[PDB]
Amino acid sequence: GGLTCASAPQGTLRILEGPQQSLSGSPLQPIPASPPPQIPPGLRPRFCAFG
Amino acid sequence: LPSARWQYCGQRAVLVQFSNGKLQSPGNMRFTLYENKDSTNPRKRNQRILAAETDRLSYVGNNFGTGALKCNTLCRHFVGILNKTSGQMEVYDAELFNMQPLFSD
């Protein structure tokens, strides 16, 4: 029950949970481009010149 | 690539911090440890007081009071041996103490 002292420890192993692999996909997923505005189909002159 | 073998046996390997410096000179220093009474609660496995008397001063180390370090609750401590003959890192359980010297009241 004396509990004598011991020598100096050489190395200290650190145990830790691993990096989060297979979380990010190898291609990227962007928000798609909002489309450029279209001229709508079915546009015709509705105004006739009077008389 | 050095390797070993994990073998967990289970006993506590007490580890000591000092509040004043490294030890660096082992000599004529007593070591006794003062666990709690009641084993019905888990206080027998948690409450412990370490005494390290020298002829000059004497050092007290707790596990429960204001001054106990938070490296044994938020983290677990082990002690390896690495018997390189059989090639096994057989690993015990540890606990870290931080001793304050005792002066007055």
Side-chain angles (χ1 to χ4, degrees):
Chain A
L3 278 73
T4 59
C5 183
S7 179
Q10 187 177 1
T12 57
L13 291 175
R14 177 69 181 165
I15 296 172
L16 51 87
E17 275 88 1
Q20 292 296 110
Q21 295 297 110
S22 179
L23 266 287
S24 298
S26 296
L28 283 81
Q29 194 270 330
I31 279 173
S34 180
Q38 282 76 234
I39 293 97
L43 293 181
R44 67 189 186 276
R46 292 178 174 88
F47 183 75
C48 62
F50 55 86
Chain B
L1 273 299
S3 296
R5 298 292 179 91
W6 188 272
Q7 291 293 114
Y8 178 70
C9 297
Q11 182 60 257
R12 292 180 179 90
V14 291
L15 298 167
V16 288
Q17 294 296 109
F18 284 102
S19 175
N20 50 9
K22 294 188 264 77
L23 190 145
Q24 192 58 257
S25 66
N28 65 14
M29 191 183 292
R30 276 84 65 192
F31 288 103
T32 180
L33 72 168
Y34 289 158
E35 286 83 358
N36 202 357
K37 291 290 180 67
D38 49 352
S39 297
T40 61
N41 295 115
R43 286 188 294 271
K44 180 66 174 66
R45 278 85 64 193
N46 290 116
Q47 302 288 105
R48 187 173 295 112
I49 293 173
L50 183 63
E53 293 90 2
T54 319
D55 52 355
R56 287 187 294 271
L57 286 174
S58 63
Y59 299 102
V60 62
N62 295 319
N63 293 118
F64 57 93
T66 61
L69 50 85
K70 275 81 67 178
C71 195
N72 56 4
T73 63
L74 297 173
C75 196
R76 288 179 66 91
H77 291 284
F78 292 160
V79 166
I81 282 93
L82 193 68
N83 296 115
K84 294 191 288 184
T85 62
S86 66
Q88 290 184 358
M89 184 179 290
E90 57 96 15
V91 170
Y92 290 157
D93 187 76
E95 202 278 333
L96 183 62
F97 289 106
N98 194 359
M99 281 89 74
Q100 302 292 114
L102 195 147
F103 292 105
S104 293
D105 187 74

